[PDB]
Short mmCIF file of C-alpha atoms and ligand atoms in Angstrom, two decimals:
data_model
loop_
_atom_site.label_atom_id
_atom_site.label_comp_id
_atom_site.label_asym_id
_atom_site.label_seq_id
_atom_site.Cartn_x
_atom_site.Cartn_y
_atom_site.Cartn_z
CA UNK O 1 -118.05 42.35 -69.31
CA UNK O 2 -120.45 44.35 -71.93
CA UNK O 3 -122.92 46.70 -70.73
CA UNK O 4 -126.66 46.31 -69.32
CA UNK O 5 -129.63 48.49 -69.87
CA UNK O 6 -132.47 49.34 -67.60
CA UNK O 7 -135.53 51.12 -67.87
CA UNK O 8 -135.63 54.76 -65.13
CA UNK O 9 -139.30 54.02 -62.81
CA UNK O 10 -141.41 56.49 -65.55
CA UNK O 11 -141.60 59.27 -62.19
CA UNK O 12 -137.52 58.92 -62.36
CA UNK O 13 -137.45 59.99 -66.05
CA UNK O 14 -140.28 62.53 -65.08
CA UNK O 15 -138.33 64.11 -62.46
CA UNK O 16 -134.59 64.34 -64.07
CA UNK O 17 -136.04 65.71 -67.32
CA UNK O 18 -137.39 68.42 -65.52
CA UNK O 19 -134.40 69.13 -63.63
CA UNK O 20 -131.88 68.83 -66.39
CA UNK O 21 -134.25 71.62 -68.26
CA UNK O 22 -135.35 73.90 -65.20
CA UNK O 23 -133.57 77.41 -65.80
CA UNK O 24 -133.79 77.42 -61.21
CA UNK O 25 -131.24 79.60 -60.37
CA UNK O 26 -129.86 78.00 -56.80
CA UNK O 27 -128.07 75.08 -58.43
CA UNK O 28 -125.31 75.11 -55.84
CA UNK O 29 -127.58 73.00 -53.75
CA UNK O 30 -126.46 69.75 -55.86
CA UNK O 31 -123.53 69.57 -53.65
CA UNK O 32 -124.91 69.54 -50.51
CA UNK O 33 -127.17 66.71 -51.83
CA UNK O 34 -124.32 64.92 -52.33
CA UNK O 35 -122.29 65.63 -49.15
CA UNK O 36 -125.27 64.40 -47.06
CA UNK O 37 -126.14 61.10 -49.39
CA UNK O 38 -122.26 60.32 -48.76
CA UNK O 39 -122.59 61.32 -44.87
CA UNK O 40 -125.56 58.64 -44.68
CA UNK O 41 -123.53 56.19 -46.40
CA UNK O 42 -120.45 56.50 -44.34
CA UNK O 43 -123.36 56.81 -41.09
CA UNK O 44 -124.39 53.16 -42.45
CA UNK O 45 -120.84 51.32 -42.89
CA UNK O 46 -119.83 52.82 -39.08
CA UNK O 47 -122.94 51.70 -37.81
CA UNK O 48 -123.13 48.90 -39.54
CA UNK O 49 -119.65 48.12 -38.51
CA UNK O 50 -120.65 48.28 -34.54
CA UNK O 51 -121.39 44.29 -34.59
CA UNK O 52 -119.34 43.19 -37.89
CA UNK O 53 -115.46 45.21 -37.56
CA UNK O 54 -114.16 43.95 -40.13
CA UNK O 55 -116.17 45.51 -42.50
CA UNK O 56 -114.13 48.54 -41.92
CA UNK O 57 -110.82 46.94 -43.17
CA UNK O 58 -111.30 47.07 -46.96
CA UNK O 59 -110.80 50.81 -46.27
CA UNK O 60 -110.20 51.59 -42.91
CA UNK O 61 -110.65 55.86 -43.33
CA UNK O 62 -113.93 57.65 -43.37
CA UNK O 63 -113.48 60.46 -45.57
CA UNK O 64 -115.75 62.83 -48.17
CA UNK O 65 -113.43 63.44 -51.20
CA UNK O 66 -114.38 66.11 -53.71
CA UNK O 67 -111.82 65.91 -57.14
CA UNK O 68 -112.28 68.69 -59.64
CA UNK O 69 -110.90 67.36 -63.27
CA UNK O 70 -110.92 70.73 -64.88
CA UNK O 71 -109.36 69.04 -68.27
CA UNK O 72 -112.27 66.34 -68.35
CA UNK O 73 -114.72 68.90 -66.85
CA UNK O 74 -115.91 66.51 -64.21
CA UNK O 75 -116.28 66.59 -60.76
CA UNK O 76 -116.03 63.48 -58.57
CA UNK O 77 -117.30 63.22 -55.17
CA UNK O 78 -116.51 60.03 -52.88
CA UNK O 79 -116.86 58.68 -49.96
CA UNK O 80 -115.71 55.30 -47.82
CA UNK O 81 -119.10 54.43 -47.06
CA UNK O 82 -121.49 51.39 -47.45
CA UNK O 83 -121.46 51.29 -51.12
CA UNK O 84 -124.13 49.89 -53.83
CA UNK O 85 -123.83 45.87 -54.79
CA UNK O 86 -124.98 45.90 -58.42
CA UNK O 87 -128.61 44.91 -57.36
CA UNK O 88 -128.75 47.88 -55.34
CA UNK O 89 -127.47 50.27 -57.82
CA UNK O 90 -130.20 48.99 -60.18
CA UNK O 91 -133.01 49.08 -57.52
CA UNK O 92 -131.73 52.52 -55.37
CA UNK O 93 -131.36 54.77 -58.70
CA UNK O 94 -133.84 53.54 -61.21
CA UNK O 95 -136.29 50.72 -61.14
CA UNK O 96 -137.98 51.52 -57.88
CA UNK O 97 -136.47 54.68 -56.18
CA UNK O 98 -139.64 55.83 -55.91
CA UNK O 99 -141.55 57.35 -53.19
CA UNK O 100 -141.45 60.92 -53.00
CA UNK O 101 -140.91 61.08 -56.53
CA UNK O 102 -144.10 61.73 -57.12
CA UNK O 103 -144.87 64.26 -54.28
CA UNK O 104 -141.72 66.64 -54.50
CA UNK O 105 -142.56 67.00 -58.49
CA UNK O 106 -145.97 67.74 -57.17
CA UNK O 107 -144.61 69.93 -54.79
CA UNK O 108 -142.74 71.96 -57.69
CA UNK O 109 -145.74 72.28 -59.66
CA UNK O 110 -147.01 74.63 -56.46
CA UNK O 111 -143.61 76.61 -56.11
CA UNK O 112 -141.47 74.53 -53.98
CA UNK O 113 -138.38 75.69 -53.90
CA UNK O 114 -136.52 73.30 -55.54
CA UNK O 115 -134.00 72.91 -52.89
CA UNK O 116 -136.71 70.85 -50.90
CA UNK O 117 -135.67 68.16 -52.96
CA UNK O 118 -133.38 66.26 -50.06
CA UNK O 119 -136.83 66.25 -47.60
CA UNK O 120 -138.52 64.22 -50.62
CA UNK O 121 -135.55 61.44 -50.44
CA UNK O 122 -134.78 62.35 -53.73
CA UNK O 123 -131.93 64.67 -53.96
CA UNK O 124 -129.72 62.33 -55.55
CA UNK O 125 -131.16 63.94 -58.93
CA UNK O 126 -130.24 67.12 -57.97
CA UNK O 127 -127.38 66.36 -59.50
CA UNK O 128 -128.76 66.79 -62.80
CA UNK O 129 -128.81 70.82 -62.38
CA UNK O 130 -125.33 71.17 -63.18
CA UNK O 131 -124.22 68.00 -65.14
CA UNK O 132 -125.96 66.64 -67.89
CA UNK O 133 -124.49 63.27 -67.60
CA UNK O 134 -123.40 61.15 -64.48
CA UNK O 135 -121.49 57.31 -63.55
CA UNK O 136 -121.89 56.28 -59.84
CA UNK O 137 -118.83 54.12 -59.47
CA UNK O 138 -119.52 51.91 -56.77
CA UNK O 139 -118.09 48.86 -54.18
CA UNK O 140 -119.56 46.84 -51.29
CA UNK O 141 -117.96 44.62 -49.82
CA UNK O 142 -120.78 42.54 -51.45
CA UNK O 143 -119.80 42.33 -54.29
CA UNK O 144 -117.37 43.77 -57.34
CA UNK O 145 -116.81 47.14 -58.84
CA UNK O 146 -119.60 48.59 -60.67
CA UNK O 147 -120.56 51.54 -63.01
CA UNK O 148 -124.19 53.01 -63.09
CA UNK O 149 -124.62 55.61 -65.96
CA UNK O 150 -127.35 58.00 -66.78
CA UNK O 151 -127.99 60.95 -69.24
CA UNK O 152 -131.20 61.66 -67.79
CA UNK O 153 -132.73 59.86 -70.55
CA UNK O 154 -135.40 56.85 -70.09
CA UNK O 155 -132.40 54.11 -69.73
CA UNK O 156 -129.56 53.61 -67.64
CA UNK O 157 -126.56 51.29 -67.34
CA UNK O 158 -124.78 49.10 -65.35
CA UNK O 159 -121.64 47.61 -66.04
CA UNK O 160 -119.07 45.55 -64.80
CA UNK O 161 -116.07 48.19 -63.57
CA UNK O 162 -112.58 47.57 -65.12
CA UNK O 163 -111.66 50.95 -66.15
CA UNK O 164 -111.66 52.82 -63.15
CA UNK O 165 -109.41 53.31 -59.76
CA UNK O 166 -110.07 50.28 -57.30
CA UNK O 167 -111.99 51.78 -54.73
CA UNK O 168 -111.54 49.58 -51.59
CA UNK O 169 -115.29 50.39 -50.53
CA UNK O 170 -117.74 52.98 -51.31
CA UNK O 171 -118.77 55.59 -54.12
CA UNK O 172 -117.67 57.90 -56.34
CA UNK O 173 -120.26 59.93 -58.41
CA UNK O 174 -118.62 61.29 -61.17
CA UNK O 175 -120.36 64.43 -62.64
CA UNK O 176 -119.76 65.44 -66.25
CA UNK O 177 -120.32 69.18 -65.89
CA UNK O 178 -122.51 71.32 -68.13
CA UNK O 179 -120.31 73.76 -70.42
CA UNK O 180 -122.39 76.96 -68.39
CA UNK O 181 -121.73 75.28 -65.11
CA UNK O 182 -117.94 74.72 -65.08
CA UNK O 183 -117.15 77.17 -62.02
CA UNK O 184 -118.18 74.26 -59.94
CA UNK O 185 -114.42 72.96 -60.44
CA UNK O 186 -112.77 75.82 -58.89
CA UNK O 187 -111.30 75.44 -55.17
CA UNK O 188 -112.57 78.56 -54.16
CA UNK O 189 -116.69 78.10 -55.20
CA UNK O 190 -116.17 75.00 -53.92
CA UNK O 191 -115.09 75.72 -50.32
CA UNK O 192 -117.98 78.38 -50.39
CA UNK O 193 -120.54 76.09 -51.34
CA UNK O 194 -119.47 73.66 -48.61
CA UNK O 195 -119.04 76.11 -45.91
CA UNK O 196 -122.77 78.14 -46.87
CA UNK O 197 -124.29 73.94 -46.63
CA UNK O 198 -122.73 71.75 -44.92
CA UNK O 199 -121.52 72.85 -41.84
CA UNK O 200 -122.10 70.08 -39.76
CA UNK O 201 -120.45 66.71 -41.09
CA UNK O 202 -118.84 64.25 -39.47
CA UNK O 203 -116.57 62.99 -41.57
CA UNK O 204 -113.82 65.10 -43.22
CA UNK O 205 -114.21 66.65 -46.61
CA UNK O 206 -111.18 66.48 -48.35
CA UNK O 207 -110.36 68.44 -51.48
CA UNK O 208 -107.86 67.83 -54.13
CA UNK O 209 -106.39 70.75 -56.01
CA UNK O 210 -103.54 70.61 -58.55
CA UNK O 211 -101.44 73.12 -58.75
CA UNK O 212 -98.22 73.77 -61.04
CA UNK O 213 -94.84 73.46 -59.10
CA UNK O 214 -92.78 77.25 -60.12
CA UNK K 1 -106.41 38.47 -67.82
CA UNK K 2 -103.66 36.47 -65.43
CA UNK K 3 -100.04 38.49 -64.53
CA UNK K 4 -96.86 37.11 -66.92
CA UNK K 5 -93.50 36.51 -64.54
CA UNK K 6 -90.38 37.30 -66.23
CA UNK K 7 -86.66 36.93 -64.91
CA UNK K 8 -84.73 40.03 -65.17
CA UNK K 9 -81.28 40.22 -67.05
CA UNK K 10 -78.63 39.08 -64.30
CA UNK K 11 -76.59 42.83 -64.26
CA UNK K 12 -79.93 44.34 -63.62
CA UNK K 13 -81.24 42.27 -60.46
CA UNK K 14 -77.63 43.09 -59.13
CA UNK K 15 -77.87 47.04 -59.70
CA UNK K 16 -81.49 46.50 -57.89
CA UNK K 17 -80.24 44.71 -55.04
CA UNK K 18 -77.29 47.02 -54.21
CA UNK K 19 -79.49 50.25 -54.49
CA UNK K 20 -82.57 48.92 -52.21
CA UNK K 21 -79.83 48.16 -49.86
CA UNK K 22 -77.56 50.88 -50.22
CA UNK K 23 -77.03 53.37 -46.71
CA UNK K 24 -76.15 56.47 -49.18
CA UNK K 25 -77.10 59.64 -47.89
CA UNK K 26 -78.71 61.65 -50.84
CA UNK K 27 -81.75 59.30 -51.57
CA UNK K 28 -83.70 62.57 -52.94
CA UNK K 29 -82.45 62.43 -56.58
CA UNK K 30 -84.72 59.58 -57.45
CA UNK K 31 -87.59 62.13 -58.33
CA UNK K 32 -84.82 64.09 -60.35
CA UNK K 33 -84.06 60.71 -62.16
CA UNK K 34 -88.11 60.22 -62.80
CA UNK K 35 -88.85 63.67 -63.87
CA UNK K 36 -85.88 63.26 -66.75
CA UNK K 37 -87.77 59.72 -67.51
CA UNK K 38 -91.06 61.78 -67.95
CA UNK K 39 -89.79 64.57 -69.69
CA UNK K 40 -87.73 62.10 -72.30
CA UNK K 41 -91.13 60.60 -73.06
CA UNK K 42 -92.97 63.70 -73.48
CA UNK K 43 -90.08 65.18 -76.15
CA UNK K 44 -90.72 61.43 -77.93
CA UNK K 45 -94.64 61.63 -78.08
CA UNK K 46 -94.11 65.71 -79.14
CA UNK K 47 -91.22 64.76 -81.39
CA UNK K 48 -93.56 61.57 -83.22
CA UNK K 49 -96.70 64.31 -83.48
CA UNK K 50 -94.61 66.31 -85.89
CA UNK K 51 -95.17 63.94 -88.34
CA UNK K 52 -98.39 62.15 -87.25
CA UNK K 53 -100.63 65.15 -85.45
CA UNK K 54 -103.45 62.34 -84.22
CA UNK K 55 -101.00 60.90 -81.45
CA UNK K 56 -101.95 63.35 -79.36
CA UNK K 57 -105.39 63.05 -79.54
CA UNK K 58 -105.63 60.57 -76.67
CA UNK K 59 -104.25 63.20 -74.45
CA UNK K 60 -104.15 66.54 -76.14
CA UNK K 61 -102.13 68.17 -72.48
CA UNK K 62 -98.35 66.92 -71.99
CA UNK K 63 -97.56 66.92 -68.13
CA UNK K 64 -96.00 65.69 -65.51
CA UNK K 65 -98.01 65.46 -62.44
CA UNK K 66 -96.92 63.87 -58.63
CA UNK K 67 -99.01 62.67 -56.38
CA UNK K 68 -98.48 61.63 -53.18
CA UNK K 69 -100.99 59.15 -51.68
CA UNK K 70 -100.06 59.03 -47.89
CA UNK K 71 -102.86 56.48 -46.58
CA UNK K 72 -101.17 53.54 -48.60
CA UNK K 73 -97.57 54.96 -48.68
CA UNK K 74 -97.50 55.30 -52.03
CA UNK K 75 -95.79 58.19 -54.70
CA UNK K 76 -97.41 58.56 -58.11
CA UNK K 77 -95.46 59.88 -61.11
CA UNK K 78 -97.34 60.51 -64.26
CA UNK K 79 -96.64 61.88 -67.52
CA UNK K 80 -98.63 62.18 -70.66
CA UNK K 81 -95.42 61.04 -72.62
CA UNK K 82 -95.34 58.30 -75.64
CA UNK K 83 -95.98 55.19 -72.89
CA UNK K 84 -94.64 51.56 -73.69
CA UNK K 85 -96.76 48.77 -75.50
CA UNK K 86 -96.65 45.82 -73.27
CA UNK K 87 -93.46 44.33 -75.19
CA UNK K 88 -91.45 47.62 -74.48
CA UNK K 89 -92.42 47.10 -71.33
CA UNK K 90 -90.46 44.05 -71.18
CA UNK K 91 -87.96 44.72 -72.97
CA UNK K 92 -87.21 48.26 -71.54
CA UNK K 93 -87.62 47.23 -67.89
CA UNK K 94 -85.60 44.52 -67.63
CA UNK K 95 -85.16 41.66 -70.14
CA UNK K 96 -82.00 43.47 -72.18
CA UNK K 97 -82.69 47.47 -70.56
CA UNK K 98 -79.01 46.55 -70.84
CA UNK K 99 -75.75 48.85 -71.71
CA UNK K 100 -74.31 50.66 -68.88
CA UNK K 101 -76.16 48.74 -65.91
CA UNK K 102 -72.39 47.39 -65.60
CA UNK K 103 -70.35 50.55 -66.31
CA UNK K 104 -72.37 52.07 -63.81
CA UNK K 105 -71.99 49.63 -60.98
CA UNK K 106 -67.90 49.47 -61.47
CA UNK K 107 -67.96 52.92 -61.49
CA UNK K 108 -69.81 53.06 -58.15
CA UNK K 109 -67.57 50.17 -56.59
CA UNK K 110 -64.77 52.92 -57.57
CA UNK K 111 -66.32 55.70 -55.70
CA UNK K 112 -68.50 57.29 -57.80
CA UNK K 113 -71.36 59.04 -56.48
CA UNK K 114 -74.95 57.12 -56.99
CA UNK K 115 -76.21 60.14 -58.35
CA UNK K 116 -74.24 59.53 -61.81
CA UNK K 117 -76.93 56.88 -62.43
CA UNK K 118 -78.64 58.87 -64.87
CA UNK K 119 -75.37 59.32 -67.25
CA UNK K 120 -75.01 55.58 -67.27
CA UNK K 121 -79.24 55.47 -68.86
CA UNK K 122 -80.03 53.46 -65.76
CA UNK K 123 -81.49 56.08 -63.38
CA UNK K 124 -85.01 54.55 -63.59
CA UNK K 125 -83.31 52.08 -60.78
CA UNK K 126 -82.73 54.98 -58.32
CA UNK K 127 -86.59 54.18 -57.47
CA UNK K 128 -85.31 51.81 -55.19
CA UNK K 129 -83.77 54.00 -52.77
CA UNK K 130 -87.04 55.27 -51.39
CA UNK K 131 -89.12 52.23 -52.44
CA UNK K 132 -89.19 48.47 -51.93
CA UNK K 133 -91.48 47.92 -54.67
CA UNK K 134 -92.80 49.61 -57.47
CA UNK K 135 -95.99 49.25 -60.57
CA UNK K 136 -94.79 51.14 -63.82
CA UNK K 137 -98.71 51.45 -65.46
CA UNK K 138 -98.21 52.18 -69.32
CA UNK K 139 -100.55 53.07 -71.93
CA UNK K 140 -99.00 53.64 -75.60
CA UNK K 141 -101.38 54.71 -78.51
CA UNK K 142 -100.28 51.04 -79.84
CA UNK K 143 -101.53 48.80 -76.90
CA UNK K 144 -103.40 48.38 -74.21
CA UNK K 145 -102.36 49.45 -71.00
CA UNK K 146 -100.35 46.99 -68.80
CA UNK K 147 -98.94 46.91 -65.04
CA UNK K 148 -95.09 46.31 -65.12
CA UNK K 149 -94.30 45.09 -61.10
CA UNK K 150 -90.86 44.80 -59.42
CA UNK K 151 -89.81 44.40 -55.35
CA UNK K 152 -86.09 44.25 -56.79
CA UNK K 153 -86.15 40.49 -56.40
CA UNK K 154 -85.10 38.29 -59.98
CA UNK K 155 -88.01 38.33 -61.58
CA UNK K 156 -90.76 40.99 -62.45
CA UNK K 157 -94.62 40.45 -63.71
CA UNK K 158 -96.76 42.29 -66.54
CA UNK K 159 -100.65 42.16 -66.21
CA UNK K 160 -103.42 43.47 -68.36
CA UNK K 161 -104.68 46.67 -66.76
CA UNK K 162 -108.16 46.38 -65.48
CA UNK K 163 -108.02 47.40 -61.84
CA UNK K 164 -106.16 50.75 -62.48
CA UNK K 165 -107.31 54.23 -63.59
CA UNK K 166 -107.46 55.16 -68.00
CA UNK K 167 -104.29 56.41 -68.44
CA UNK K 168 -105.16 58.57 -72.08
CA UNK K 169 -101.75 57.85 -73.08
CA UNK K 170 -98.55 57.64 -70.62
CA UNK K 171 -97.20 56.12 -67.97
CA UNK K 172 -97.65 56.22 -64.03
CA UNK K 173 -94.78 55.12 -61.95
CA UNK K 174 -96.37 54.08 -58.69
CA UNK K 175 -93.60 53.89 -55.55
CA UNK K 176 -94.36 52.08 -52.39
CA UNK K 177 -92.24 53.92 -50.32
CA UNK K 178 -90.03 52.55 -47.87
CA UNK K 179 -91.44 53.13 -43.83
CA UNK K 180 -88.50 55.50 -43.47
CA UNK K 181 -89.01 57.60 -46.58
CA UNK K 182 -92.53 58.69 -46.30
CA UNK K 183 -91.27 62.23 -45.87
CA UNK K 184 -91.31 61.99 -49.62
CA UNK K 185 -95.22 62.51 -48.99
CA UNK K 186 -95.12 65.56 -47.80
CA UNK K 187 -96.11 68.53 -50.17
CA UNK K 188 -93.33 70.87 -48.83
CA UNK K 189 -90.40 67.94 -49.62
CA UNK K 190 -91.55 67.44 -52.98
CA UNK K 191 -91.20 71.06 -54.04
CA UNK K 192 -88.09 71.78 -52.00
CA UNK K 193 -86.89 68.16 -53.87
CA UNK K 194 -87.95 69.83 -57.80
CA UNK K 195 -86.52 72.91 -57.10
CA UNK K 196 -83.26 72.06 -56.49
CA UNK K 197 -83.35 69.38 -59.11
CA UNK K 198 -85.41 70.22 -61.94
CA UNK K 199 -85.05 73.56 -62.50
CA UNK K 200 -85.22 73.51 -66.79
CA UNK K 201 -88.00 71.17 -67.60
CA UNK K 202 -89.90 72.44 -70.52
CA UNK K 203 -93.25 70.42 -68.88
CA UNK K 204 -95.56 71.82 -66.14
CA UNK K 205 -94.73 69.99 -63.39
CA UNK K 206 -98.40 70.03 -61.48
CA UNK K 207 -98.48 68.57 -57.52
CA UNK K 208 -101.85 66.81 -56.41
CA UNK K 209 -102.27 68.51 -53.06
CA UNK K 210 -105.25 66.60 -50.49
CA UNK K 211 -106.42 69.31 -48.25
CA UNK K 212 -109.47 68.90 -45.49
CA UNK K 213 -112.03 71.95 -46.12
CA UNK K 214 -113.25 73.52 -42.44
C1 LIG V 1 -125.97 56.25 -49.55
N1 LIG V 1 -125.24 55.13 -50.15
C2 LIG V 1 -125.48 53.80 -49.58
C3 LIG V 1 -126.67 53.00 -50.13
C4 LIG V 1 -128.01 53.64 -49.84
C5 LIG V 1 -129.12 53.03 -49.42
C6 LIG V 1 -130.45 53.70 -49.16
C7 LIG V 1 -131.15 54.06 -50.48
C8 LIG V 1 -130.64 55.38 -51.03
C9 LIG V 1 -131.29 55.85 -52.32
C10 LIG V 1 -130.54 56.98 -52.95
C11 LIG V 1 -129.19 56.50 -53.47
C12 LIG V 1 -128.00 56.81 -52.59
O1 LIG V 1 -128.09 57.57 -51.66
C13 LIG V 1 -126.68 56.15 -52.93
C14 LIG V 1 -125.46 57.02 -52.72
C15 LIG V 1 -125.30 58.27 -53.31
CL1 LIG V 1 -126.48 58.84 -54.41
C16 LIG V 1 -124.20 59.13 -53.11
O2 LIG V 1 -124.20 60.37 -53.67
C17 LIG V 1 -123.16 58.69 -52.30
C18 LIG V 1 -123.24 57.44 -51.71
O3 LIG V 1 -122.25 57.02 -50.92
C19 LIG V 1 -124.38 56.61 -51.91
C20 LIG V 1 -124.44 55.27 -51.22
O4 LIG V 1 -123.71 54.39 -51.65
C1 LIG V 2 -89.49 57.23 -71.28
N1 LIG V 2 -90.72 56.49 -71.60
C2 LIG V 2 -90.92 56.12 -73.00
C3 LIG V 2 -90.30 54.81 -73.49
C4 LIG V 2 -88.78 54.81 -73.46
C5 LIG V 2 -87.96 54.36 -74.40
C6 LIG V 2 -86.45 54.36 -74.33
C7 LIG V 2 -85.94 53.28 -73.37
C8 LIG V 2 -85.97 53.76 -71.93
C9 LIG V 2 -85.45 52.78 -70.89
C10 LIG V 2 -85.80 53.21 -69.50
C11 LIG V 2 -87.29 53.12 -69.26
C12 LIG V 2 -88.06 54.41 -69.35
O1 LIG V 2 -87.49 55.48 -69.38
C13 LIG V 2 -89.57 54.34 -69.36
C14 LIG V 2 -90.27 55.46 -68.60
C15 LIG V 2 -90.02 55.73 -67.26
CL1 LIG V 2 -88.96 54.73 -66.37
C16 LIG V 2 -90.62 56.78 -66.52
O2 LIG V 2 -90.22 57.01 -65.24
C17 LIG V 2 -91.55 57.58 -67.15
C18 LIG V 2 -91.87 57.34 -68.48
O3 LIG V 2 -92.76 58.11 -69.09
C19 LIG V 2 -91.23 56.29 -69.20
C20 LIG V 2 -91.59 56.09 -70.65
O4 LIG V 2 -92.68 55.60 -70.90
#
């Protein structure tokens, strides 16, 4: 299909501006935003999946997957989790999504340390310290493949997915990395980030590296 | 859009149907027989940008890149090479893909050794000793990109692309692997499997290695 606009929640455009411009200096703390959004999400599907099985089978591994694509510089992290129908896309990152909003922003104003963001239920946009431009790529059993896109700007979209890898169930945000912020595809950073943050997951995190054959 | 069946030329469903079937001992020199495929149709899309410089601007790097997906017992092969429109996809795999598909079979009926397939222009075929079915994905600057699918029975379907990964520009030769084969999965294998093989290929060759971070 064609593409459909939304309007951000005017907090939501309020907050990402602010974080797409701060000059902050701990932006490694995206990732473990990320890593813990896709822990709850694979936390939901398993527990979800306690009284309905078989909504393990359209992808019966629970995995975190983190895929540096140094030529497009973007990074993609999935996971096999719950996954967004499109209503929820458009109501989780946008047209509500409020709630703390409002208070972490406040909280920033009075020197919070922006890595306070996850206890806000916000962290999500933490995203926006090192990319400039994101698509959650998303499937519930629900429903069909989706694609949410923001530039941090007042609008997102949400279109109809048939450009991208089937994924049986779950999310991949793909992160189209700011030209000062490209160390974030290297294996080593990585691993360091994940080790300093995330120490206690789950669910495996897998990493993909590419490496020449000599 | 639906998938289009089409019945493979009669010499070819033969040469399929010995080769899945076959109890020869050196199974290996398929991936010799698709790294040839891949580097022919990188020289074509370098050899056509001599004249015409904006071919390669749908994929400005020319690789060749494996990667083994062991949860659905599939090997990928891509290359960044010229890709077939969705005619030359059916022609080329199948309809005529004619010429020594006969030569090659008497010769084997006489002794010779299946890995001669490649002198005979057929070795594309040699997929089938490590797979019982196989998607060629193609995207040529020309078209659109199509799925070309095959289980060596006598026919074969093409299918508009919208479930799939953008290929720039190329092709992706997805094997599913046969239970016995899945060594062919295996990171160690592969590069053992190039070495031997592949030795003079004027392509990086880059492996897509999946490794849990702890
Ligand atoms: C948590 N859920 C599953 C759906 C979440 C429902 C609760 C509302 C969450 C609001 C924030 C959005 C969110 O966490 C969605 C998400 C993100 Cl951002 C992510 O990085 C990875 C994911 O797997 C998901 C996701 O699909
Ligand atoms: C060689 N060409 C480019 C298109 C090839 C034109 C000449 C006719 C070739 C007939 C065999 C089919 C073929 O080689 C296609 C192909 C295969 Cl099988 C492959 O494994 C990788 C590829 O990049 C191609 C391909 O697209």
């Amino acid at each position: 299909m064609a593409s459909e606009t939304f309007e951000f929640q005017a907090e939501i455009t309020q907050l990402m501006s602010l974080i797409i411009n701060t000059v902050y200096s701990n932006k490694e703390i995206f990732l473990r935003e990320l890593i813990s959004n896709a822990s709850d999400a694979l936390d939901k599907i398993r527990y979800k999946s306690l009284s309905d099985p078989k909504q393990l089978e359209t992808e019966p591994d629970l995995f975190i997957r983190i895929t540096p694509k140094p030529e497009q510089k973007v990074l993609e992290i999935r996971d096999s989790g719950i996954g967004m129908t499109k209503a929820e896309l458009i109501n989780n990152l946008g047209t509500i999504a409020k709630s703390g909003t409002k208070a972490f922003m406040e909280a920033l104003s009075a020197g919070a340390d922006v890595s306070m963001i996850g206890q806000f239920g916000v962290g999500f946009y933490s995203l926006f310290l090192v990319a400039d431009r994101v698509q959650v790529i998303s499937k519930s059993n629900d429903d069909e493949q989706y694609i949410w896109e923001s530039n941090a700007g007042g609008s997102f979209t949400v279109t109809l997915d048939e450009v991208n890898e089937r994924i049986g169930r779950g999310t991949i945000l793909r992160l189209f990395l700011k030209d000062d912020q490209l160390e974030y595809l290297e294996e080593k950073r990585i691993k360091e980030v994940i080790k300093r943050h995330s120490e206690f997951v789950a669910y495996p995190i897998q990493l993909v590296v590419t490496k020449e054959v000599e």
